[PDB]
Amino acid sequence: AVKKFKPYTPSRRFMTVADFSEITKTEPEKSLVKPLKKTGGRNNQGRITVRFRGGGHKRLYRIIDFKRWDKVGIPAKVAAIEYDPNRSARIALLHYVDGEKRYIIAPDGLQVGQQVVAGPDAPIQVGNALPLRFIPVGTVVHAVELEPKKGAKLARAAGTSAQIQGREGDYVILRLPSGELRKVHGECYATVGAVGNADHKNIVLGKAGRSRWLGRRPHVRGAAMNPVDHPHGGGEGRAPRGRPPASPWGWQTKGLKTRKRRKPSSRFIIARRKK
Amino acid sequence: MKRTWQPNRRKRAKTHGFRARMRTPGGRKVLKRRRQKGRWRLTPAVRK
RNA sequence: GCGGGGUGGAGCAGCCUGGUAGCUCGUCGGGCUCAUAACCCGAAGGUCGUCGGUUCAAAUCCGGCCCCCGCAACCA
RNA sequence: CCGAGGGUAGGGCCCGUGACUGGGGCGAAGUCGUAACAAGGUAGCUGUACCGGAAGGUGCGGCUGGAU
RNA sequence: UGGGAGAGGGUGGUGGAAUUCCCGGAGUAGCGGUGAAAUGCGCAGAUACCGGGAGGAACGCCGAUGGCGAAGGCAGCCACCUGGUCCACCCGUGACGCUGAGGCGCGAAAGCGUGGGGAGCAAACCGGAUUAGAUACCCGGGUAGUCCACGCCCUAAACG
RNA sequence: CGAUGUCGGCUCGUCGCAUCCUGGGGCUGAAGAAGGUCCCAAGGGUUGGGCUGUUCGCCCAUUAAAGCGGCACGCGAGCUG
RNA sequence: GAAUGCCGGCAUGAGUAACGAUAAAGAGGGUGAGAAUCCCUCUCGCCGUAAGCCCAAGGGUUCCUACGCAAUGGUCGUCAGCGUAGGGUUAGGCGGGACCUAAGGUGAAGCCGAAAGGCGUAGCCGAAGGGCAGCCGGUUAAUAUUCCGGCCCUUCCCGCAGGUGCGAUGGGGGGACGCUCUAGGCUAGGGGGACCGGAGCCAUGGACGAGCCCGGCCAGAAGCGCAGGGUGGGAGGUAGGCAAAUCCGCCUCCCAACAAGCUCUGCGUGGUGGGGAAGCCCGGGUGACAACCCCCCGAAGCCAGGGAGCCAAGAAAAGCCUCUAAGCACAACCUGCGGGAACCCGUACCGCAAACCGACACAGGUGGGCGGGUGCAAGAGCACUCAGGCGCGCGGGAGAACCCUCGCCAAGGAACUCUGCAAGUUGGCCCCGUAACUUCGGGAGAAGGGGUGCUCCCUGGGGUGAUGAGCCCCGGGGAGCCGCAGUGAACAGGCUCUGGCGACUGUUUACCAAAAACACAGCUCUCUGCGAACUCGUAAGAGGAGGUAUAGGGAGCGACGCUUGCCCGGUGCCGGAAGGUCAAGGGGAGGGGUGCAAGCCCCGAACCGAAGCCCCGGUGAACGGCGGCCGUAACUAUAACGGUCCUAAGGUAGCGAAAUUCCUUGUCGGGUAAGUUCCGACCUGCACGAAAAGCGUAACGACCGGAGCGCUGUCUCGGCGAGGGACCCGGUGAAAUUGAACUGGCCGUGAAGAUGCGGCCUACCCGUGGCAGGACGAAAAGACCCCGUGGAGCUUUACUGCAGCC
RNA sequence: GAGCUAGCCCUGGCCAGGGUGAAGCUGGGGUGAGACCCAGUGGAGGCCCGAACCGGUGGGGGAUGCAAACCCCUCGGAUGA
Ligand SMILES: NC[C@H]1O[C@H](O[C@H]2[C@H](O)[C@@H](O[C@H]3O[C@H](CO)[C@@H](O)[C@H](N)[C@H]3O)[C@H](N)C[C@@H]2N)[C@H](O)[C@@H](O)[C@@H]1O
Ligand SMILES: [Mg+2]
Ligand SMILES: [Mg+2]
Ligand SMILES: [Mg+2]
Ligand SMILES: [Mg+2]
Ligand SMILES: [Mg+2]
Ligand SMILES: [Mg+2]
Ligand SMILES: [Mg+2]
Ligand SMILES: [Mg+2]
Ligand SMILES: [Mg+2]
Ligand SMILES: [Mg+2]
Ligand SMILES: [Mg+2]
Ligand SMILES: [Mg+2]
Ligand SMILES: [Mg+2]
Ligand SMILES: [Mg+2]
Ligand SMILES: [Mg+2]
Ligand SMILES: [Mg+2]
Ligand SMILES: [Mg+2]
Ligand SMILES: [Mg+2]
Ligand SMILES: [Mg+2]
Ligand SMILES: [Mg+2]
Ligand SMILES: [Mg+2]
Ligand SMILES: [Mg+2]
Ligand SMILES: [Mg+2]
Ligand SMILES: [Mg+2]
Ligand SMILES: [Mg+2]
Ligand SMILES: [Mg+2]
Ligand SMILES: [Mg+2]
Ligand SMILES: [Mg+2]
Ligand SMILES: [Mg+2]
Ligand SMILES: [Mg+2]
Ligand SMILES: [Mg+2]
Ligand SMILES: [Mg+2]
Ligand SMILES: [Mg+2]
Ligand SMILES: [Mg+2]
Ligand SMILES: [Mg+2]
Ligand SMILES: [Mg+2]
Ligand SMILES: [Mg+2]
Ligand SMILES: [Mg+2]
Ligand SMILES: [Mg+2]
Ligand SMILES: [Mg+2]
Ligand SMILES: [Mg+2]
Ligand SMILES: [Mg+2]
Ligand SMILES: [Mg+2]
Ligand SMILES: [Mg+2]
Ligand SMILES: [Mg+2]
Ligand SMILES: [Mg+2]
Ligand SMILES: [Mg+2]
Ligand SMILES: [Mg+2]
Ligand SMILES: [Mg+2]
Ligand SMILES: [Mg+2]
Ligand SMILES: [Mg+2]
Ligand SMILES: [Mg+2]
Ligand SMILES: [Mg+2]
Ligand SMILES: [Mg+2]
Ligand SMILES: [Mg+2]
Ligand SMILES: [Mg+2]
Ligand SMILES: [Mg+2]
Ligand SMILES: [Mg+2]
Ligand SMILES: [Mg+2]
Ligand SMILES: [Mg+2]
Ligand SMILES: [Mg+2]
Ligand SMILES: [Mg+2]
Ligand SMILES: [Mg+2]
Ligand SMILES: [Mg+2]
Ligand SMILES: [Mg+2]
Ligand SMILES: [Mg+2]
Ligand SMILES: [Mg+2]
Ligand SMILES: [Mg+2]
Ligand SMILES: [Mg+2]
Ligand SMILES: [Mg+2]
Ligand SMILES: [Mg+2]
Ligand SMILES: [Mg+2]
Ligand SMILES: [Mg+2]
Ligand SMILES: [Mg+2]
Ligand SMILES: [Mg+2]
Ligand SMILES: [Mg+2]
Ligand SMILES: [Mg+2]
Ligand SMILES: [Mg+2]
Ligand SMILES: [Mg+2]
Ligand SMILES: [Mg+2]
Ligand SMILES: [Mg+2]
Ligand SMILES: [Mg+2]
Ligand SMILES: [Mg+2]
Ligand SMILES: [Mg+2]
Ligand SMILES: [Mg+2]
Ligand SMILES: [Mg+2]
Ligand SMILES: [Mg+2]
Ligand SMILES: [Mg+2]
Ligand SMILES: [Mg+2]
Ligand SMILES: [Mg+2]
Ligand SMILES: [Mg+2]
Ligand SMILES: [Mg+2]
Ligand SMILES: [Mg+2]
Ligand SMILES: [Mg+2]
Ligand SMILES: [Mg+2]
Ligand SMILES: [Mg+2]
Ligand SMILES: [Mg+2]
Ligand SMILES: [Mg+2]
Ligand SMILES: [Mg+2]
Ligand SMILES: [Mg+2]
Ligand SMILES: [Mg+2]
Ligand SMILES: [Mg+2]
Ligand SMILES: [Mg+2]
Ligand SMILES: [Mg+2]
Ligand SMILES: [Mg+2]
Ligand SMILES: [Mg+2]
Ligand SMILES: [Mg+2]
Ligand SMILES: [Mg+2]
Ligand SMILES: [Mg+2]
Ligand SMILES: [Mg+2]
Ligand SMILES: [Mg+2]
Ligand SMILES: [Mg+2]
Ligand SMILES: [Mg+2]
Ligand SMILES: [Mg+2]
Ligand SMILES: [Mg+2]
Ligand SMILES: [Mg+2]
Ligand SMILES: [Mg+2]
Ligand SMILES: [Mg+2]
Ligand SMILES: [Mg+2]
Ligand SMILES: [Mg+2]
Ligand SMILES: [Mg+2]
Ligand SMILES: [Mg+2]
Ligand SMILES: [Mg+2]
Ligand SMILES: [Mg+2]
Ligand SMILES: [Mg+2]
Ligand SMILES: [Mg+2]
Ligand SMILES: [Mg+2]
Ligand SMILES: [Mg+2]
Ligand SMILES: [Mg+2]
Ligand SMILES: [Mg+2]
Ligand SMILES: [Mg+2]
Ligand SMILES: [Mg+2]
Ligand SMILES: [Mg+2]
Ligand SMILES: [Mg+2]
Ligand SMILES: [Mg+2]
Ligand SMILES: [Mg+2]
Ligand SMILES: [Mg+2]
Ligand SMILES: [Mg+2]
Ligand SMILES: [Mg+2]
Ligand SMILES: [Mg+2]
Ligand SMILES: [Mg+2]
Ligand SMILES: [Mg+2]
Ligand SMILES: [Mg+2]
Ligand SMILES: [Mg+2]
Ligand SMILES: [Mg+2]
Ligand SMILES: [Mg+2]
Ligand SMILES: [Mg+2]
Ligand SMILES: [Mg+2]
Ligand SMILES: [Mg+2]
Ligand SMILES: [Mg+2]
Ligand SMILES: [Mg+2]
Ligand SMILES: [Mg+2]
Ligand SMILES: [Mg+2]
Ligand SMILES: [Mg+2]
Ligand SMILES: [Mg+2]
Ligand SMILES: [Mg+2]
Ligand SMILES: [Mg+2]
Ligand SMILES: [Mg+2]
Ligand SMILES: [Mg+2]
Ligand SMILES: [Mg+2]
Ligand SMILES: [Mg+2]
Ligand SMILES: [Mg+2]
Ligand SMILES: [Mg+2]
Ligand SMILES: [Mg+2]
Ligand SMILES: [Mg+2]
Ligand SMILES: [Mg+2]
Ligand SMILES: [Mg+2]
Ligand SMILES: [Mg+2]
Ligand SMILES: [Mg+2]
Ligand SMILES: [Mg+2]
Ligand SMILES: [Mg+2]
Ligand SMILES: [Mg+2]
Ligand SMILES: [Mg+2]
Ligand SMILES: [Mg+2]
Ligand SMILES: [Mg+2]
Ligand SMILES: [Mg+2]
Ligand SMILES: [Mg+2]
Ligand SMILES: [Mg+2]
Ligand SMILES: [Mg+2]
Ligand SMILES: [Mg+2]
Ligand SMILES: [Mg+2]
Ligand SMILES: [Mg+2]
Ligand SMILES: [Mg+2]
Ligand SMILES: [Mg+2]
Ligand SMILES: [Mg+2]
Ligand SMILES: [Mg+2]
Ligand SMILES: [Mg+2]
Ligand SMILES: [Mg+2]
Ligand SMILES: [Mg+2]
Ligand SMILES: [Mg+2]
Ligand SMILES: [Mg+2]
Ligand SMILES: [Mg+2]
Ligand SMILES: [Mg+2]
Ligand SMILES: [Mg+2]
Ligand SMILES: [Mg+2]
Ligand SMILES: [Mg+2]
Ligand SMILES: [Mg+2]
Ligand SMILES: [Mg+2]
Ligand SMILES: [Mg+2]
Ligand SMILES: [Mg+2]
Ligand SMILES: [Mg+2]
Ligand SMILES: [Mg+2]
Ligand SMILES: [Mg+2]
Ligand SMILES: [Mg+2]
Ligand SMILES: [Mg+2]
Ligand SMILES: [Mg+2]
Ligand SMILES: [Mg+2]
Ligand SMILES: [Mg+2]
Ligand SMILES: [Mg+2]
Ligand SMILES: [Mg+2]
Ligand SMILES: [Mg+2]
Ligand SMILES: [Mg+2]
Ligand SMILES: [Mg+2]
Ligand SMILES: [Mg+2]
Ligand SMILES: [Mg+2]
Ligand SMILES: [Mg+2]
Ligand SMILES: [Mg+2]
Ligand SMILES: [Mg+2]
Ligand SMILES: [Mg+2]
Ligand SMILES: [Mg+2]
Ligand SMILES: [Mg+2]
Ligand SMILES: [Mg+2]
């Protein structure tokens, strides 16, 4: 439940930060962090290939376990719930009875001090991971592999979830957060429950500087540039688009579908996304 | 105000140095061209 | 300066592609109704801005004149 | 020292007036429609919301102070 | 103390009918709609029929002139949490009562904020008829809204 | 056009007279006073403000009067901008 | 002989401007052929969060000394960062290397690319980051944590003693981390002392004093003391830490927890070694057996990896500890001691500048540390000042106009002007007090006021110490004194009302624009199911992202409030398995060439045949668009009402002579004596209007308007004063420009604006200070305009390609 | 050619002093329990004033400059984008 500020400055009027109530441990497990090489949007050529990036807070990457089938049958205790700057969700510190320690993104409601476990015969309990084919139809689920043994790829953002709609052969039918209906293979793992921290979307950044701390350099409009720079560049005084609205590279940006038509996975999408 | 020459021995050596030249087709053509002209020094002198 | 226009009382067709002026409203005579409107049945009114020309023949094609909208009048 | 009061600055209440503007009341025979009284020709009234030259209309829910 | 009736309230579950959409089959020349029609939909295969799926909303019969609540109001079924109330016995306290300016709380619908949701319905809006006109009544579409959570609004033919 | 800096203001003036005032006149539908109209006359004089970049103009308060024009729409190797 | 030709030489301007911050000079004595300029002394002024001192970078002998004065030095020169010569830079401990990693670079493996080459795991390189052992003093003309003296320490080799399962590039711990706030105890640093030491001093009216002036320390191993930091012990199980593992991790059980114990740093002390002033005398000698003590203030530094809070969630690797593995346990490692060993490069000097970057001994630029005292509330602000360093490498006169910087002004007080431009006013602290409006924070330092010094007296609380004195810090009350004046000097808001634009802090056209522009949180559309979309790339590969629809791309709008209407015909985008069109390919009716012929060869219709286009739908916070004429009310006028034409549909809300209104200074009202601007209205809106958003909006603004108060040299209207120049003298000595010149006025003339022609008029020869009318003065082969079948940037439903995509 | 300039990356450093007083916490009042209110503590902020530092608002000087962008007076930011 988000936290407001009183208007003691112009920017505190609307600024809201997260309450951080589910957090129990306020420093990362040293054994599971590595330096995050900040890119600034640049690639190996040195070239900006994503505009308006750089200059945000230093971070340590927390190594998240996305293939929970690495430890089938070994229960783990939920030791802590920590803040991860590399994702919208929280993360849970797991002490396995193995003695091995791993992070997972924290589902919603997961309580520190519960045992979680992964595998085909595991319970249908928040935090347990199963092959999709063993989760009952209608169960919300997250951290869903897209292909078997390839890693949790779907539903990882705060408050996201995917609902199991039905099975069909070697494949179960998932409704992803986008509302798309997809056939994902039944041997793909998935952690039952929805991802936590659902209030994450209700955060009002509050000021320009906060966008900067998140690494987001200011964003200038095509309409603000010259024809050298943008389809919407130039003009005397202001100006409507004067052509169908377009990206800096010329291609149209209001409606133009960009999914590759002949993609092989088209065979496995049932219904394109809603809304 | 600040002018354009801000001398720096490391920068000078890592930019126009002999080895910076040899590592590159255009840099070895420099040395070749400067040798053929009979340049006394094929490369800036920088004291290190 | 360039563009379009002027036709029964009102607003519009017909001019391009020469012969024939049409649509709605209105107006007038009758019907219905106790009466009015509505509605129904009939009918009248335009020599086509004006003069000149082409022509067998001009609303129509070509000139001039009159009036009426529209666009333009930039570089110092 | 206090002190009538004079002065400088800022407030509060009241009154009169003001281009213009809003609705209101009233005034024999001007214009438009016909909402209501009969089931008034879509039963009516209603709180609310939106819309419309105007009475009003429509949605949602409510009342019988509704006919048969 | 022992008993009883009830859609009284809140929470979490969950069941069938139906409408809509979607996929499959079977199938052909219209369906729909009205006072009559038109718009609309339909040989790009609609309507009617069968199997499958998704989803929202409201709970048919029971149902009553019925029951419950202070009022607004509450109706599929199940469990939990909780309010009021009535009866028997005549056991306890011993006037501890009544009303109630202010106060505080509740308060249908529409409406507002932030999320979600969205099948049917449907202000606005578009179209078709009617009409002298028809910013209506009728018809075909259709967006807020109607639904959920939290927070507001606090109105009423909030009536016996 | 191998450059004659272009409005207005300010400063500095100087000339024309088709004279705004002051001086001298004629005619008057000149009683006086005050006007009208023309002639002669360039010696001197010809205000301070509100508005607008403004020149101009309207306006305020005066005045004997608040003249009109030329000098590269006088004057930026004098200022302003 | 001309090319604004090219190279060079020398002229002109001219003995002209200028000689580079207005911090400032004067005299005496030296030296020398020569002295404003060099040396010494005395006096004067200037910096003093530097204009002093120490590093780094860069510079590269500029350092020190001797001898020099041609050139360099904006003058001079005996001087010098200049010429010649000789000298000078000393390290196991400082810095860098023989250690470690960061971005990045490179790169066995591997991938990619016509060639060149591009990527890339490990590994390697890579530092101002991590790790690692030296402090104080003396000495030289010139080096010093480097030489010397004192007291400490590091690593390597070898040996001795004791100890131990020893052993690693492998496992593990640790190294190891942000921002803000901050406790306790110290140190740096500083103030005071009637105490200790000191050469002296008594002036000029007073003072022989508890007088003046000067100084009262630095470093130091073990031990010890104070303050901190780091740290549980044991046992059993064990399936994880890619072998093992007694370590680590996880579970369990016993004891220990603001402790203690162990360990580590800081500070104090500490054997010992140093230092030691003014003043006097010639860098030194004395002082001097110098004294070396007490109190206070006190860090931003130290203990430190301390504590609390917050969200934006805060390097790596080695050293180090620990676990074992091969091997080996005659080993090996650990500890203590001893002897030996310890290499390469830097070290001068400048270093906010005359030695670096700016062509210059250039008023500009340059990162880190120290930066003392007193007062002003604080402070690195301000004034003065210590140490220390300077007076800026032309001077002397004079006391014009004029220019710059500055000071003052009678009466008036914006009358100045595009504009209060500029300059006044205001100004610090403390106390009183403070409006509309508001998003409840604000507006607010609103506005406006009072106080402010010195002396005596009484009195309250803190810190230190001890509870007291002393010191130091906050206060309260009373009575007085002086001046024109008490933040007495210096630093230090003018205020109010009202509009436009933009929410706001931010950003921008380096060097004419700082704004209303960009950005901004926030809103919506849209694309993206992850080998995502999109971007860079021929590719490999990257970015996206070690992210996964509450995410990432693109686009518009731009806090917030209230809202955002109608049109899908045209364009775009989305949907559409039919139909139409459609290239290669399939097909081969049917022709043709040739051959004796089998055959070879060519053409070729029907029909099948993608995307695209056509066609059918949808779609506006997609591109965009949102009418005309005529009539009508019982005064007039106006038209709620009607007629008709056209459209895809005819502009809704709200705004409106506006950053938009042409006519226009619209009309009316307000404000003024007077208002083309301003504010409020009206609405025939030339030519507002709803995310190229509409209408508002508290707060914010070096934005742009209007008004008022204050106050003023802005002005009526100018005066006087100061200093720096201008002027005169000595020294040095430019510049653009220049056909040649023996270069007047008028009126004419002339290629139409004549010193140069004609006529007349005027005028002896040559300067100096001044002014700017002319030389169509200088400068720049007009930047406007035109021309050129000149060029370049941009656009598009111009043409033709190409990338990309289908 | 990024020793100027622009953006990013890695690693360090800098920001005198003064003011305002958010959340929270504590105590008290309040209630059925609350919300809430008062005080104290606390020390938030693209918060305020203002040096260093970063700027470059207006005006004046300068214009063969001290300077091919400088000087003076004034002004913006100064815990942050
Ligand atoms: N000209 C002068 C007259 O003017 C009014 O009279 C007029 C009314 O106003 C009209 O009434 C309308 O307006 C009312 C407002 O509600 C409605 O109720 C009513 N339904 C309407 O028809 C009515 N049509 C005509 C009548 N002559 C005065 O009253 C009358 O004294 C005076 O002499
Ligand atoms: Mg708060
Ligand atoms: Mg949380
Ligand atoms: Mg780490
Ligand atoms: Mg580790
Ligand atoms: Mg790279
Ligand atoms: Mg490269
Ligand atoms: Mg299979
Ligand atoms: Mg939101
Ligand atoms: Mg948000
Ligand atoms: Mg941004
Ligand atoms: Mg964004
Ligand atoms: Mg933008
Ligand atoms: Mg632009
Ligand atoms: Mg470009
Ligand atoms: Mg482009
Ligand atoms: Mg373009
Ligand atoms: Mg454009
Ligand atoms: Mg533009
Ligand atoms: Mg425009
Ligand atoms: Mg500068
Ligand atoms: Mg240069
Ligand atoms: Mg430098
Ligand atoms: Mg560099
Ligand atoms: Mg080669
Ligand atoms: Mg080459
Ligand atoms: Mg007609
Ligand atoms: Mg007509
Ligand atoms: Mg026609
Ligand atoms: Mg009739
Ligand atoms: Mg009828
Ligand atoms: Mg006729
Ligand atoms: Mg005619
Ligand atoms: Mg005739
Ligand atoms: Mg004929
Ligand atoms: Mg005729
Ligand atoms: Mg005719
Ligand atoms: Mg005529
Ligand atoms: Mg012009
Ligand atoms: Mg009184
Ligand atoms: Mg009196
Ligand atoms: Mg009196
Ligand atoms: Mg009458
Ligand atoms: Mg009538
Ligand atoms: Mg009705
Ligand atoms: Mg009726
Ligand atoms: Mg009715
Ligand atoms: Mg009735
Ligand atoms: Mg309506
Ligand atoms: Mg209306
Ligand atoms: Mg109408
Ligand atoms: Mg209407
Ligand atoms: Mg309606
Ligand atoms: Mg009711
Ligand atoms: Mg019982
Ligand atoms: Mg019972
Ligand atoms: Mg068919
Ligand atoms: Mg109920
Ligand atoms: Mg009984
Ligand atoms: Mg009884
Ligand atoms: Mg009893
Ligand atoms: Mg009793
Ligand atoms: Mg009793
Ligand atoms: Mg009451
Ligand atoms: Mg209610
Ligand atoms: Mg409701
Ligand atoms: Mg609302
Ligand atoms: Mg009809
Ligand atoms: Mg109609
Ligand atoms: Mg309608
Ligand atoms: Mg309607
Ligand atoms: Mg009832
Ligand atoms: Mg010219
Ligand atoms: Mg002029
Ligand atoms: Mg003047
Ligand atoms: Mg005349
Ligand atoms: Mg006389
Ligand atoms: Mg006479
Ligand atoms: Mg007479
Ligand atoms: Mg007279
Ligand atoms: Mg004269
Ligand atoms: Mg005029
Ligand atoms: Mg005139
Ligand atoms: Mg006028
Ligand atoms: Mg007179
Ligand atoms: Mg002229
Ligand atoms: Mg002129
Ligand atoms: Mg000029
Ligand atoms: Mg001028
Ligand atoms: Mg020349
Ligand atoms: Mg020349
Ligand atoms: Mg030459
Ligand atoms: Mg000469
Ligand atoms: Mg001269
Ligand atoms: Mg000079
Ligand atoms: Mg000088
Ligand atoms: Mg001087
Ligand atoms: Mg003598
Ligand atoms: Mg001598
Ligand atoms: Mg001599
Ligand atoms: Mg000082
Ligand atoms: Mg100095
Ligand atoms: Mg110096
Ligand atoms: Mg260095
Ligand atoms: Mg040099
Ligand atoms: Mg010399
Ligand atoms: Mg000489
Ligand atoms: Mg000389
Ligand atoms: Mg290395
Ligand atoms: Mg490479
Ligand atoms: Mg290093
Ligand atoms: Mg070292
Ligand atoms: Mg020393
Ligand atoms: Mg010697
Ligand atoms: Mg020394
Ligand atoms: Mg061992
Ligand atoms: Mg932070
Ligand atoms: Mg120390
Ligand atoms: Mg003594
Ligand atoms: Mg005496
Ligand atoms: Mg004595
Ligand atoms: Mg054991
Ligand atoms: Mg494992
Ligand atoms: Mg292992
Ligand atoms: Mg393993
Ligand atoms: Mg193992
Ligand atoms: Mg102990
Ligand atoms: Mg110990
Ligand atoms: Mg001695
Ligand atoms: Mg410090
Ligand atoms: Mg410091
Ligand atoms: Mg510091
Ligand atoms: Mg070696
Ligand atoms: Mg040295
Ligand atoms: Mg220096
Ligand atoms: Mg420095
Ligand atoms: Mg120097
Ligand atoms: Mg030099
Ligand atoms: Mg000099
Ligand atoms: Mg300098
Ligand atoms: Mg300091
Ligand atoms: Mg004092
Ligand atoms: Mg000294
Ligand atoms: Mg010096
Ligand atoms: Mg000087
Ligand atoms: Mg003189
Ligand atoms: Mg003289
Ligand atoms: Mg002068
Ligand atoms: Mg005065
Ligand atoms: Mg005054
Ligand atoms: Mg003006
Ligand atoms: Mg003004
Ligand atoms: Mg000013
Ligand atoms: Mg306040
Ligand atoms: Mg004040
Ligand atoms: Mg104000
Ligand atoms: Mg005094
Ligand atoms: Mg004490
Ligand atoms: Mg101030
Ligand atoms: Mg305006
Ligand atoms: Mg702004
Ligand atoms: Mg600010
Ligand atoms: Mg600029
Ligand atoms: Mg520039
Ligand atoms: Mg420039
Ligand atoms: Mg330039
Ligand atoms: Mg430039
Ligand atoms: Mg600004
Ligand atoms: Mg918004
Ligand atoms: Mg590309
Ligand atoms: Mg490509
Ligand atoms: Mg690729
Ligand atoms: Mg990644
Ligand atoms: Mg996102
Ligand atoms: Mg409001
Ligand atoms: Mg419409
Ligand atoms: Mg359309
Ligand atoms: Mg369409
Ligand atoms: Mg369309
Ligand atoms: Mg169409
Ligand atoms: Mg072809
Ligand atoms: Mg074909
Ligand atoms: Mg075909
Ligand atoms: Mg096709
Ligand atoms: Mg179509
Ligand atoms: Mg749009
Ligand atoms: Mg009439
Ligand atoms: Mg009509
Ligand atoms: Mg339509
Ligand atoms: Mg319009
Ligand atoms: Mg509308
Ligand atoms: Mg106007
Ligand atoms: Mg208007
Ligand atoms: Mg307009
Ligand atoms: Mg107005
Ligand atoms: Mg728009
Ligand atoms: Mg408001
Ligand atoms: Mg501004
Ligand atoms: Mg204006
Ligand atoms: Mg205006
Ligand atoms: Mg004042
Ligand atoms: Mg003056
Ligand atoms: Mg003077
Ligand atoms: Mg002539
Ligand atoms: Mg002539
Ligand atoms: Mg002439
Ligand atoms: Mg002279
Ligand atoms: Mg001249
Ligand atoms: Mg030319
Ligand atoms: Mg032009
Ligand atoms: Mg041109
Ligand atoms: Mg051509
Ligand atoms: Mg051309
Ligand atoms: Mg750079
Ligand atoms: Mg740069
Ligand atoms: Mg701030
Ligand atoms: Mg400036
Ligand atoms: Mg600057
Ligand atoms: Mg500027
Ligand atoms: Mg100036
Ligand atoms: Mg100033
Ligand atoms: Mg200023
Ligand atoms: Mg500030």
Author numbering:
A (entry chain 1D): 2 to 276
B (entry chain 17): 1 to 48
What does the paper say about this structure?
The crystal structures of the Thermus thermophilus 70S ribosome in complex with mRNA, tRNAs, AMK or KAN were determined at ~2.9 Å resolution by molecular replacement using a high-resolution model of the 70S ribosome with the tRNA and mRNA ligands removed (see “Methods”). In addition to binding to h44 near the decoding center, KAN binds to three secondary sites in the T. thermophilus 50S subunit. One KAN molecule interacts with helix H88 located in domain V of 23S rRNA, the other KAN contacts helices H40 and H42 in domain II, and the third KAN is found at the base of the A-site finger helix H38, interacting with helix H85 and with Lys8 of protein uL16. While these secondary binding sites are not likely to be physiologically relevant and probably the result from the high concentration of drug used during crystallization, they nevertheless enrich the catalog of interactions between small molecules and RNA. The interactions mediated by the AHB group of AMK with the P-loop likely contribute to the binding of AMK to this site because KAN, which lacks the AHB moiety, does not bind to the P site of the 50S subunit. The AHB hydroxyl group and the chemical moieties decorating ring III form multiple interactions with ribosomal protein uL14 residues Tyr7, Glu45, Glu54, and the main chain carbonyl oxygen of Lys44.
The majority of antibiotics inhibit protein synthesis by targeting the ribosome, the molecular machine responsible for decoding messenger RNAs (mRNAs) and correspondingly incorporating incoming amino acids into the nascent polypeptide chain. They interfere with protein synthesis by targeting the region of 16S ribosomal RNA (rRNA) helix h44 forming the decoding center within the 30S subunit of the ribosome (inset 1). Binding of 2-DOS-containing aminoglycosides to the decoding center displaces two universally conserved nucleotides, A1492 and A1493, promoting their interaction with the minor groove of the codon-anticodon duplex in the aminoacyl (A) site of the ribosome. AMK is synthesized by the addition of the 4-amino-2-hydroxy butyrate (AHB) group at the N1 amino group of the 2-DOS moiety of kanamycin A (KAN).
